[PDB]
Amino acid sequence: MKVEELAESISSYAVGILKEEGIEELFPPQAEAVEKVFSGKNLLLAMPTAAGKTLLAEMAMVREAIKGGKSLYVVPLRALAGEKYESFKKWEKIGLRIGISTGDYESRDEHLGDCDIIVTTSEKADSLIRNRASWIKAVSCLVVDEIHLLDSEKRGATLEILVTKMRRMNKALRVIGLSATAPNVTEIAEWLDADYYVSDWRPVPLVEGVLCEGTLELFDGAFSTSRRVKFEELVEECVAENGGVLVFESTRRGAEKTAVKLSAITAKYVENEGLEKAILEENEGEMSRKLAECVRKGAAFHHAGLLNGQRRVVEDAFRRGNIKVVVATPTLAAGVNLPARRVIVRSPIFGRPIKVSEYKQMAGRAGRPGMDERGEAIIIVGKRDREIAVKRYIFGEPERITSKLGVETHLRFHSLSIICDGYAKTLEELEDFFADTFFFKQNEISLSYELERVVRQLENWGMVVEDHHLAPTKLGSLVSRLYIDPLTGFIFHDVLSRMELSDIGALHLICRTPDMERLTVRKTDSWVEEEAFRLRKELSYYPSDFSVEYDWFLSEVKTALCLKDWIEEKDEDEICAKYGIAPGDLRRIVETAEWLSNAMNRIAEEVGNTSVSGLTERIKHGVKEELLELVRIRHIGRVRARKLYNAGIRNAEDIVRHREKVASLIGRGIAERVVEGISVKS
Numbered sequence: 001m002k003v004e005e006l007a008e009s010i011s012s013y014a015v016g017i018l019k020e021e022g023i024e025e026l027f028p029p030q031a032e033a034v035e036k037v038f039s040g041k042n043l044l045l046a047m048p049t050a051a052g053k054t055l056l057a058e059m060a061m062v063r064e065a066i067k068g069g070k071s072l073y074v075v076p077l078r079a080l081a082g083e084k085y086e087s088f089k090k091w092e093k094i095g096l097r098i099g100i101s102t103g104d105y106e107s108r109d110e111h112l113g114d115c116d117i118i119v120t121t122s123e124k125a126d127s128l129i130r131n132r133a134s135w136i137k138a139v140s141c142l143v144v145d146e147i148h149l150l151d152s153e154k155r156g157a158t159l160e161i162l163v164t165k166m167r168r169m170n171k172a173l174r175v176i177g178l179s180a181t182a183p184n185v186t187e188i189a190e191w192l193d194a195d196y197y198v199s200d201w202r203p204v205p206l207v208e209g210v211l212c213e214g215t216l217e218l219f220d221g222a223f224s225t226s227r228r229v230k231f232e233e234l235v236e237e238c239v240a241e242n243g244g245v246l247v248f249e250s251t252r253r254g255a256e257k258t259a260v261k262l263s264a265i266t267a268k269y270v271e272n273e274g275l276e277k278a279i280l281e282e283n284e285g286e287m288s289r290k291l292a293e294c295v296r297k298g299a300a301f302h303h304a305g306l307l308n309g310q311r312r313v314v315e316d317a318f319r320r321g322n323i324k325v326v327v328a329t330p331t332l333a334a335g336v337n338l339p340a341r342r343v344i345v346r347s348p349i350f351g352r353p354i355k356v357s358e359y360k361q362m363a364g365r366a367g368r369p370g371m372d373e374r375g376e377a378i379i380i381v382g383k384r385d386r387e388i389a390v391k392r393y394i395f396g397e398p399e400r401i402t403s404k405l406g407v408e409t410h411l412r413f414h415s416l417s418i419i420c421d422g423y424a425k426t427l428e429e430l431e432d433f434f435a436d437t438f439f440f441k442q443n444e445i446s447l448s449y450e451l452e453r454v455v456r457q458l459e460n461w462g463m464v465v466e467d468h469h470l471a472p473t474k475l476g477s478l479v480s481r482l483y484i485d486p487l488t489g490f491i492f493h494d495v496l497s498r499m500e501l502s503d504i505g506a507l508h509l510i511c512r513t514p515d516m517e518r519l520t521v522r523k524t525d526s527w528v529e530e531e532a533f534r535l536r537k538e539l540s541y542y543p544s545d546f547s548v549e550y551d552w553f554l555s556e557v558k559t560a561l562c563l564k565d566w567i568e569e570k571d572e573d574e575i576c577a578k579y580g581i582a583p584g585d586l587r588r589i590v591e592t593a594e595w596l597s598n599a600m601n602r603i604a605e606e607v608g609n610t611s612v613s614g615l616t617e618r619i620k621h622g623v624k625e626e627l628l629e630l631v632r633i634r635h636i637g638r639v640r641a642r643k644l645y646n647a648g649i650r651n652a653e654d655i656v657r658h659r660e661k662v663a664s665l666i667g668r669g670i671a672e673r674v675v676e677g678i679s680v681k682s
Contacts, residue, residue, distance in 0.1 A: 001025055001026040001030070001031040001034065002024070002025055003015050003018050003019060003023055003024055003025060003026065006018075006034065006059065009034070009038040009059075009063055010038075010059050010062050010063050010066070011062075011066060011094065013094040014059070014062050014091075014094060016094075017090055017091065017093060017094055020090075020093075021090065023055070026052070027051055027052050027201070027203060028199075028201055029047055029051050029052075029197070029199040029201045030051070030052050030055065030056055032197065032199070033045060033047075033056055033197040033199075034056070034059070036195050036196075036197055037056045037059060037060050038059070038060070038063055039195070040174060041174075041194065041195050042174055042175045042176070042192045042193050042194035042195070043060075043174075043175075043176045043177070043194050043195050043196070043197070044147075044176075044177045044179060044185060044186070044188055044189035044192060044194045044195070044196040044197075045057070045176070045177070045178050045179065045196070045197050046179040046180065046181050046182070046185040046196065046197070046198040046199075047181065047197070047198070047199050047200075047201070048180065048181065048200065048201075048202050048364055049180075049334075049364070050202050050203050050204070050364070050367070050369060051199065051201055051202055051203065053178050054084070054087070054145075054178070057073070057143045057145070057176055057178055058088065058091070060141065060143070060176055061073065061116075061117050061141060061143065062091060062096065064140060064141045064174070065096055065116040065117070069140030069141055070115070070116055070117075070118075070135075070138050070139050070140055070141070071116065071117050071118070071139065071140070071141040071142070071143060072118050072120065072125060072136075072139045072141070072142050072143070073088075073117060073118065073119050073120070073143045073145065074120055074121060074122045074125050074142070074143070074144055074145065074162070075119070075120075075121055075122075075145045075146065075335065076121065076122060076145075076146050076149050076155050077121065077333050077335060078121060079333055079335055079336065080121075080145070080146075080333065080334075080335035081100060081101075081119050081120065081121055082100070083335055083337070084119050084145070085098065085100040085119040088117055088119065091116075091117065096116045096117060097114055097115045097116050097117075098115060098116070098117050098119070099111070099112040099115030099117070099118045099119070100118070100119040100120070101118070101119070101120040101121070101124045101125075101128065105482065105483075105595060105598050105599070106127070106131055106481045106482060106483075106602075107128075107131065108128065108131050108132065108133040108134065109128060109133060110133065110134060110135065112133075112135060113134065113135030113138065118139075122144075122155070122158045122159055122162050123158055123483070125162055126158060126161065126162050126165070126417075126483075127481075127483050129162075129165055129166075129421065130417050130420065130421060130480050130481050130483065131481055136166075136169070137169065137170065139166070139170070139173070140170075140172070140173065140174060141173070141174045141175075141176065142163070142166055142173055142174070142175050142176070143176045143177075143178065144159060144162075144163065144175065144176070144177045144178065145178045146178065146179070146180075146334065146335075147159065147177035147178060147179045147188060148179045148180045148182055148185070148188075148401050150188065150401050150402075150403060150404075150438055151182075151357070151399070151401040151402060151404070152404065153404045153407075156403060156404040156405065156438075157404060157405045157407075157410040157413075157414065159438075160403065160405050160437045160438045160439060161405075161414045161418075161437070163175065163192075163438075164433065164436045164437055165418075165421070165423060167436070168423065168433070168436065175192050175194065177189075177192055177194065180357075180361070180398070181198065181199075181200055181398065182357070182398050182399070182400065182401050183397060183398070183399075183400055184400045184401055185198060185401070186198070187401070187441065187442065188401065188438070190441065191438050191441040202364070202367070203367075203369040204366075204367030204368065204369050204372050204373075204374065204375050205220075205367070205373075205374050205375070206363065206364065206366055206367055206374075206375045206376075206377060207219060207220045207374060207375070207376055207377070208363055208376075208377045208378075208379075208394045209224075209376065209377070209378045209379070209394070210378070210379050210380075210381055210386055210389050210390055210394065211229070211231065211234070211378050211379065211380045211381070212380075212381055212382070212383055212386045213383060214228060214229070214230055215227070215228060215229075216228075216229050216234070216378065217390075218376070218378075219390075219394055219395075231344070231380060232262075232265065234342070234344065234378065235247070235262055235265060235325060235342075235344070236265045238341055238342045239265060239266055239269055239298075239324040239325060240269065241341075242321045242324070243340070243341035243342060243368075243371075243372070244318065244321065244324070244338075244339060244340035244341055244342070244368065245262075245324065245325040245326075245340055245341070245342050245343075245344065246325075246326055246328065246338055246340040246342070246343045246344070246362075246365060246366075247259075247262070247325065247326070247327040247328070247343075247344045247345075247346065248327075248328055248329070248330055248332070248343070248344070248345045248346065248347045248362050249327055249328070249329060249346055249347050250329070250330070250346070250347035250348060250349040250350065251329070251349075252301075252303045252304075252305055252329060252582075254346070254347075255301040255302070255303055255327045255328060255329055256287075256290060256301045256303075256327075258301070258327045258346070259291075259294050259299050259300060259301035259325070259326075259327040260290065260294060260299075262299050262325045262327065263293070263294045263297040263298070263299035263325075264297075265299075265325075266297050266298035266299045266323075266324040266325055267297040267298060269298060269324060270297075270298035270322060270324060271296060271297070271298070272295055272296055272298065272317065272322050272323070273296055275295045275296065275313060275317050275322060275323070276292045276293070276295050276296035277292075278309075278313050279291050279292035279295050279310055279313055280292045281309075282307055282309055282310075282583075283307060283310075283572065283573070283583045284573075285572075285573035285576060285577075285583060286573075286577075287305060287306075287576075287582050287583065288307075288310070288583065291306065291310060291314075295313070295314065295317065295323060298322065298323055298324045298325070299323065299324065299325045299326075299327070300314040300317075300318070300323050300325070300326050300327070301326070301327045301328070302314055302315075302326050302327065302328040302329070302332060303328065303329040303331065303584075304329070304331055304582075304584055304585065304588070305581070305582025305583065305584045305585055306582070306583075306584045307583050307584050307587060308584070308587070310584075311584075314326060315336060315338065318338055318340075319337070319338070319339065326338060326340075329347075330347050330350045330354065330358060330362070334361060338365065339365075339368040340365060340366060340368070340375075341366065341367065341368055341371070341372045341375060341376070342366060342375070342376045342377075342378070343362055343363060343365050343366040343375075343376070343377045343378070344377075344378050344380065345359065345362055345363070345377065345378070345379045345380065346380045348381075348385070355398075355399060356392065356393055356396040356397065356398055356399060357398040357399050359379075359393045359396075360396075360398050362377070363377035364377075379393060379394070402442060403437070403438045403439035403441075403442050403443070405434075405437055405438070405439040406439050406443070406445070406447070406450075408450065408453075408454065409485070409514075411434075411447065411450060411451060411454045412454045412457060412458065412485075412486055412487075413485055413486065415430060415451060415454050415455065415458065416458055416463055416464070416472075416476060416479065416480050416486050417480040418430060418433055419455075419458075419464055419470050419471070419472055419476070420472040420476055420477050420480035420481075421480070424470065425469045425470055425471075426469055426470055427448070427451065427452060427455065427470070430451050430455070430470070431446055431447065431448050431451055434446075434447050434451065455470065457486075458476065458486055461486055461487075461489075461490040462475050462476070462490070462493065463475060463476035463479060463486055463489070463490070464476050474606070475489065475493055475603075475606070476489075478602060478603065478606060479603075482598075482599040482602060484513070484515050484596070484599050485513065485514045485515050487513065487514050488513035488514060488515045488596070488599070489599075489603065491509070491512055491513050492509065492513070492599065492600045492603045492604075493603050493607065495509055495540040496509075496600070496603055496604045496607055496609040496612070497607045497609070499540065500609060500610075500611035501538075501540065501611050501612055502538045502611075503564060503567065503615070504535055504538050504539070504560060504561075504564050505538045505539055505540060506597075506600065506611070506612040506615055507560040507563045507564055507567075507593070507615075508538075508539050508540065508556055508557060508560040509540050509600065510560070510563070510593055510596045510597060510600060511555075511556040511557070511559040511560045511563070512540070512541075512556050513596065515592070515595075515596055516559065516592060516593065516596055517559075517588065517589055517592050518555045518556060518558075518559045519555060519558045519559045519562060519579060519580075519581065519589075520555065520580075521551065521554045521555050521558055522580060525554070525558060528554050528557055528558045528561065529554060531557065531561055532553070532554060532557040535557075539557075558579070559589070561579075562575060562578075562579045562581075562586070562589065563589070563590070563593050563619065565578070566586070566590060566619070566622045567615075567618045567619055567622055567623065567624070568624065569622065569623060569624060569627075569638055569642055572586060572622075590619060590620075590622065593619050594616060594619045594620045597612070597615050597616040597619050598616050600612055600615075601613060601615070601616055621637065621638055621641075622637075622638045623638045623641060623642075626645060626650075627641040627642065627645055629650070629651045629652070630644055630645060630650070630651070630652075633652055633655070633674060633677065633678060634673075634674070634677045635670060635673050635674050635677065636674060640666045640670070643665050643666055644662065644665060644666065647661065647665055649661065649662060649665070652678045652681075655671075655674060655675060655678060656675060656678055656679065659671060659675055662674070662675070
């Protein structure tokens with residue numbers, strides 16, 4: 001479409017921006033879709049990612065800004081948000097202000113009001129609405145990326161409620177949904193009152209195959225070919241041509257073992273001693289050293305136990321071809337762009353068989369446009385499951401997208417904020433709200449009976465009052481703005497209004513709530529019961545029987561003991577080994593606990609309980625109180641802070657007055673950076 005044919009709808013300046021990015025002509029599906037893209041009607045675009053639907057959304061947002069509007073772009077994950085924000089920055093060159101929402105817990109991010117394109121997640125967009133962010137009402141166009149996640153038990157409900165809140169607030173809102181292909185995507189279009197464009201076109205053709213007992217059968221449509229080959233050669237022939245290989249495994253253990261195996265192959269072709277160093281800079285425990293050795297050899301594994309920095313290092317080096325093979329778990333976020341000529345799937349389990357949808361998502365990553373004439377996706381399978389792999393996955397179709405909203409926890413969680421935000425003042429109005437959801441579109445089931453039960457539960461919890469009408473209480477408003485589960489708020493409020501808590505008491509209180517991630521109690525964790533009894537008088541409760549409540553309690557206690565070791569400055573590798581977790585797990589647990597500690601303190605303040613104040617910053621840094629002054633300094637975390645403090649250097653003044661000693665204690669380069677920062681701040 002020559003791109004210049006777009007100059008009438010987006011500016012000629014915008015065409016210029018596209019040319020500077022290299023885009024001279026559009027893909028066939030894009031050219032077919034642009035007319036609907038530049039209309040004012042709601043629109044659903046269902047295409048593979050490689051077919052360029054994000055660019056179509058971008059041009060829609062650019063045109064919306066020229067028309068005097070303002071666009072909110074929502075993604076399901078923070079990482080996806082960073083990627084899209086950085087990619088959208090190019091539009092600043094023609095004067096568009098691009099913003100991304102903050103990490104703050106209960107903020108309005110009012111600064112974003114003057115942006116023309118705002119990137120956020122769906123949870124954060126809902127939070128911004130709950131906190132009365134004033135610029136939401138100025139949004140004229142909402143783009144919902146990955147709207148097929150309506151199918152997800154974890155993420156679908158939030159998408160339904162967010163879209164409904166925005167459409168009821170602004171009748172003139174234009175909604176654009178971006179989806180993977182699925183058999184019923186037009187039902188999503190119908191829910192949005194939208195036009196649609198659906199296409200399976202991809203820029204690189206994909207062939208899909210099964211490897212069984214040393215024979216590969218490969219399919220282009222209904223036509224197949226056969227080859228005598230093994231897994232190792234399938235990887236190596238690709239590595240030798242810098243083609244990029246992505247291997248999916250079911251478990252972390254499998255991914256690590258396969259990455260170590262393949263590193264022997266990749267070592268013949270590359271060495272990255274700098275990348276090995278980068279892998280080890282935050283952590284150098286057992287997993288990290290194994291990963292660093294893989295990376296120096298040109299391989300990597302990729303799972304939730306890596307630190308975020310390690311994941312970023314692996315992803316960038318893979319995009320650069322320094323890392324030849326990445327062995328990942330199926331948790332690998334869809335938005336992580338990992339261009340590979342060849343995808344190899346050895347992960348039959350996920351959690352629970354792998355969905356056809358998930359297999360197809362792994363398969364569609366194969367084929368690097370402009371490099372590969374063909375992408376290959378290969379399932380490795382035993383002779384027993386070979387027919388299943390051929391017939392249900394290779395020749396399968398992705399499942400129908402079906403609402404997961406109709407579950408009591410989602411109904412309770414969202415009904416609280418619907419009532420708090422004023423979207424519904426009566427039971428009939430609450431039912432009317434839910435009649436606008438995708439759930440209702442698919443099922444036409446009125447939830448009156450279930451919603452009544454949920455409202456009664458919220459009323460027994462002190463979150464709402466059913467007077468003449470339905471209203472939030474003070475606690476309900478607070479809980480809604482904190483974005484915690486109503487049950488979490490009830491537990492916090494009930495305990496903190498009755499008693500003061502020690503450290504372990506408040507950590508355990510956090511670990512009682514449904515929002516906290518808890519550790520699994522293993523057969524070797526009898527010390528957890530010992531510690532639970534020894535500390536029981538510090539806890540907000542202790543079970544009476546040895547019922548299943550007791551096992552749940554032991555899980556809460558083990559998680560609280562982990563957080564306790566964290567804030568008592570235990571070495572993080574020792575924490576990982578003691579609790580059977582990886583460094584990335586400890587970071588994720590700590591971040592979740594920090595968020596919930598903040599919410600617990602807000603509730604504590606409202607009831608006049610001072611006994612958990614100070615916990616949140618300790619959880620944030622993993623330090624005893626004495627170190628807080630030091631860790632607020634940039635480049636000073638728990639380790640450097642403890643080293644300085646133990647040498648008598650206990651605040652920024654001491655650092656500045658003892659530069660030489662500081663340099664001997666934590667390194668001269670580090671000390672120069674730290675002194676520079678402190679002198680800057682004064």
